[PDB]
Amino acid sequence: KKFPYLKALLERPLVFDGAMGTELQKRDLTPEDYGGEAYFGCPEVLNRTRPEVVREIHLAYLEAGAEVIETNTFGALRHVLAEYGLEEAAEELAFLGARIAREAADPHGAFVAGALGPGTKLVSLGQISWDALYRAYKEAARGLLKGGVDLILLETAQDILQVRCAVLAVREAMAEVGREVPLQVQVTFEATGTMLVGTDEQAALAALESLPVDVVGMNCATGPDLMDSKVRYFAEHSTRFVSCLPNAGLPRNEGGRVVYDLTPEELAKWHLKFVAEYGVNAVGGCCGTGPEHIRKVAEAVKGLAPKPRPESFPPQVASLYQAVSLKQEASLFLVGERLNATGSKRFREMLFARDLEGILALAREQVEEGAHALDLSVAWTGRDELEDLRWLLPHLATALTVPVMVDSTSPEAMELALKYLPGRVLLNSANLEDGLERFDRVASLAKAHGAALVVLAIDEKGMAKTREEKVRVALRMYERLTEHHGLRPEDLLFDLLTFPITQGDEESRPLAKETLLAMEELRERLPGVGFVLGVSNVSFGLKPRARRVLNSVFLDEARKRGLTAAIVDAGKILPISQIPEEAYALALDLIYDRRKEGFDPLLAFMAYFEAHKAFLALPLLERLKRRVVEGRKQGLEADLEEALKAGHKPLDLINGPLLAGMKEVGDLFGAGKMQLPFVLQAAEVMKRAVAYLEPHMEKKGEGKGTLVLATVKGDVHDIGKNLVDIILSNNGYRVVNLGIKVPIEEILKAVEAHKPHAVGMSGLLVKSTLVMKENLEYMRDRGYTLPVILGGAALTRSYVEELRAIYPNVYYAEDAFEGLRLMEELTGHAPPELTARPVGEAPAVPRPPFFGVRVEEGLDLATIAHYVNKLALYRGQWGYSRKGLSREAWQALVEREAEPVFQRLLKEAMAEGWLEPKVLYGFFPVAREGEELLVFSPETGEVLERFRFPRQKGGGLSLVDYFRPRFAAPLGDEADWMPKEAFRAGARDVLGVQLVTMGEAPSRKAQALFASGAYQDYLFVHGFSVEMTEALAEYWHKRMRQMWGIAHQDATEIQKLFQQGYQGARYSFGYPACPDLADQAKLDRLMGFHRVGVRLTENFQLEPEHATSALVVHHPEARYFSV
Ligand SMILES: [K+]
């Protein structure tokens, strides 16, 4: 409003500049240019040594259409510059940078943002002190302000505590030089999805909303693909203006020059979405981006009308990691009390002994028991408060999931706490016991750091005990906090005091009620504010069970009167339902002071508990059943030996509780109350129970019946088969698993030896359905009429009845549990219930970055993880079924249960290194000749290979139709950049090729988990591995499109990519458009699959398991089709 920059943000989208760093690399500067060898590479020193070079880059961006340029001052901080011996030059280099930008900006009417980066040292991990970090930002911001920047920009924030430190430092520099400007703060979200130190986007925005920041936003780390979700969050929720400056995606080496593939036109489309859909206010580029990126962005967003920002932000608190709302719906905001020195005894002794692992474990307990935040008080009689805090707080900063309520009478101790604790904190003591000047101290501290304040109702003349007092004190404090200090009502939590009403004393017994009555009046009079109570103090001086109940009831009553938070022992808080009826009634009589003549509620409440008052306390029979159903590994072997000592025979133990459990699991799975991963968890408990009882039995029985299970010849790792093995074995039966790639010779060899009820055949691949026919054709000659059970994703239910002519007894199995039902009926444990348009010419031939084939190693797995089809993973692979559930209810199920597994598996795979993404990829000059695609050499021009792609029957569609014919007249420049010899030979098109692999490691790891009987982790690890390999193919296809110059036609939503929402298509050998696997040997010769550790078999199958190749087609009308 006041400042021109914020006026401009209201009127139009402001286009920021792109990268300074990458633009300097083009100029090929020398140590002389940086003013010495020591200073070489420091861009900020160029403000001194070569201003004209910095000026020129600003001009290039201004001309392109940036209305805002950033000063070349990112690392103009003491501790950053120290690496170059320039620690003393921060204010100078900041100033000169700001003066260079000012000179470039003034003719163009453009804004200048005083950019300061996050530095090289993280405050939250104690790599730099608050005071040191504070000084560096204050120094460099005075320089920026003196050079005439129109805003201060805190860029690339990794540490949310640095954001608070830098905001305060910068605001004080403004005070010193007597000039305010708007403050823009931009965080950086890693591809993992949080800031580097751990802060998610909810925590980051909660922190920023409490501080005096005019524009919040995002830059660097990722391209716009991964930013989308984060920038959507900021745009939708932030009351401030929103900025967004993505990278040009992941970098790529190209002859020792670092190259980025995100084009101007793609960036433009992303920023158009961010401005037009989400209402982002400023947009620019970060690493990789140049003037051309800015040019296209400006063109895209010019003219668009800004959306107005939300008026309000929900009141919420934040730790280093996560946000928590102060208003908890229905419930309360529970603050754990047990990290108090005076209160808790266990904490007190742990603090004195310096038992960190004890204190953190205690803090975990409170969180598990349902604390939303934790109270912290270390103020003991004698001890140095500051010194105990200095020891403890660095560990709490990074250890704690939940935020902290700093409970201290000392403002010095509070200020110290605020310098260690990241996020948005609460402060406990804001009261007028020692006059205004110590109340105002804590308030200004809460306002400056953006903390939520607990406003305790204690004035100069003693405490507030009655209703009238509690009200009058609270209104005086509310007036002070709002009008003087400027704190919002939502920031305040008023503690109307909570006095003890027990101990047998009168005067104490009507005070719990005057709190409740005052709470009502202030709820109505002061809307917006919160209400906290030290709830455990009402029952101070009472037996353990008695205090538990009275506390629970006073909590509930306070809630009804308007309580929004409470300091409690969350573990002990009872729902009033579970309090017995007499106790509840007496607790209320006590609270509200309902003395009849022959009745004291304190006596009767006390008297009640005198002479009154896990699944381990169950029957031994039923406990072993629920061990299976609930999937409880711990205490199985302990309970089994207890059963054996009571003379329970192993067979009737297995057939009794344990098979009863797996039956209940089969029923719950049918009813959709239990999903597949948890069913496998039950099967583990069963397999552990069998394995314990195997040495303690003489039976060695055949079970319900035998089954010879196997996977067909020329197939691959069939998890589906192994799930049959798991489910059947642990439902009583005896499977013999023959493995994969078994021919019909050795499968029937098992049949004569074992002599089974049924013979299971299975196959993942589509081509092994015809190999199953050949198996059944082989069997009828020898005269076999055993009931064969066919299954797999390859087969269909109609096809087994059509195959029933060849073999009489053949049955389908959709999943493992149909295969179970089948085996029940055969063995006799159940009744027999089962007894094309033509292709127009391409508008261009897109120019690739190179011809030939390259290798790309070490692609960021978090970037790849973005392109996972989570629907395919969670529903398909992991078996979180959709049927009998809504589409928003299923999204809740997976975000609860599946998504944490994924996050864990991603973190594991990155740390432990068991996904190794490699990519073999390239472009070849090609041409159609008839019904063939000729692949010409980039060097010689000779025809290296020829592909006869199948055409659809009845003169239909073919892959060759997407390619230009030999000797065609060029559509444009092709002669200038096609390989000279190939072009003379008649090549007139380009074909992309790609082979991606995650390596052999995830296959080994999956097999080892199945071999160890960790069935659930086998399911998870296998599924994750498949879809991460598909994600790498999806990701790389996007990279191929980007470097080809066609990715501006991609969808800006990821699920649209999975529905081919992009130009062209990729095609793998096996797909119905090209089902001949033999062509993969042609692609091996062109590319050289050994270069990324991929091998092609005799049967033209790729090894290892997690590997896929594809032809990549640029043609806009290219779509998936079938012959
Ligand atoms: K920039």
Residue numbers in the entry: 37 to 649, 658 to 879, 897 to 1184
Question: Can you provide the manuscript's text about this entry?
Answer:
Cobalamin-dependent methionine synthase (MS) is a key enzyme in methionine and folate one-carbon metabolism. MS is a large multi-domain protein capable of binding and activating three substrates: homocysteine, folate, and S-adenosylmethionine for methylation. Achieving three chemically distinct methylations necessitates significant domain rearrangements to facilitate substrate access to the cobalamin cofactor at the right time. Here, we use a thermophilic MS homolog (tMS) as a functional MS model.
To that end, we crystallized full-length 132 kDa tMS in its apo-form and solved the structure to 2.78 Å resolution. tMS adopts a compact, wreath-like form, and each domain aligns well with previously determined structures of equivalent excised domain or tridomain constructs. The original apo-full-length structure reveals the global orientation of each domain, resembling the reactivation conformation (Act-On) and displaying the flexibility associated with the linker regions that connect each module. The active site of the helmet-shaped Act domain is positioned above the Cob domain, where the cofactor would sit, similar to the position of these domains as previously determined with the structure of the C-terminal MS fragment, that includes the Cap, Cob, and Act domains, trapped in the reactivation conformation. Notably, tMS crystallized in the apo-form; despite the absence of Cbl, the Cob domain retains the same Rossmann-fold demonstrated by the superposition of apo-tMS Cob domain with the Cbl-bound Cob domain of E. coli MS structures that have so far been determined. The four helical bundle Cap domain is displaced ~25 Å from the resting Cap-on state and virtually identical in form and position to previously captured Cap-off structures. As such, cofactor entry is not occluded and its binding site is solvent accessible, with the Cob domain found to be preformed and ready to bind Cbl requiring minimal rearrangements. The tandem TIM-barrel Hcy and Fol domains are poised adjacently, separate from the Cob:Act domains and align well with previous structures of either the excised Fol domain or with the N-terminal fragment consisting of the Hcy and Fol domains. The edge of the Hcy domain rests against the distal side of the Act domain, forming extensive interdomain contacts through >25 hydrogen bonds and salt bridges resulting in a buried surface area of ~900 Å. Two out of four linker regions, Lys649-Asp657 (Linker II, Fol:Cap) and Glu877-Ala897 (Linker IV, Cob:Act) could not be modeled due to a lack of sufficient electron density, though the other linker regions, Pro342-Asn352 (Linker I, Hcy:Fol) and Met741-Gly747 (Linker III, Cap:Cob), could be modeled. As the only structure obtained for any B12-dependent methionine synthase in its apo-form, this structure gives a unique insight into the potential domain movements required prior to and once cobalamin is loaded.
